Amino acid sequence: IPPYNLSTHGDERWFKLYIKHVVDNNSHIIYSGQLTDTNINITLFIPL
Amino acid sequence: KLRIIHNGYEGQKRNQCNLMNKYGKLGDKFIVYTSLGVNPNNSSNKLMF
């Protein structure tokens, strides 16, 4: 995950990443965190 | 599976290394400094940049 973008923080800095279509068509939230320079390496387990 | 990391030996190396990461991308080319000392004169710190 990239340091800062597409734009500057306003209004809110935070980024959240979701999962979808696994058991349900609606998306479900798997990770939520603040966006920070310079790099973020997140490793997830995803079920099928 | 091979793992290559840029983190400094706890101490100055990690600080310099964190500067490299914070203000620059990988593959970028630059000068770093091996020996850092506190001055006999002009210092009250025992601390260094």
Residue B45, token pair as written in the block: 């710190």
Give the experimental resolution in Å.
Answer: 3.5
Closest approach of chain A CAs to the CA of B21, in angstroms? 7
Judge whether A43 and A31 are in contact, CB under 8 Å: no
Residue linked to tokens 């068509």: A25
A38 and chain B in contact, CB less than 8 A = yes
Chain A residue numbers touching B21 (CB-CB < 8 A): 38-39
Tell me how far apart the alpha carbons of residues B44 and B42 are, in angstroms, rounded to a whole number. 7
DSSP calls for A1-48: --SS-SS--SS---EEEEE-SSS-SS-EEEEEE---SS----------
Q: Confirm or reject contact between B1 and chain A (CB < 8 A).
A: no
Q: Which of A36, A37, A34, A2 is nearest to A15 (CA)?
A: A34
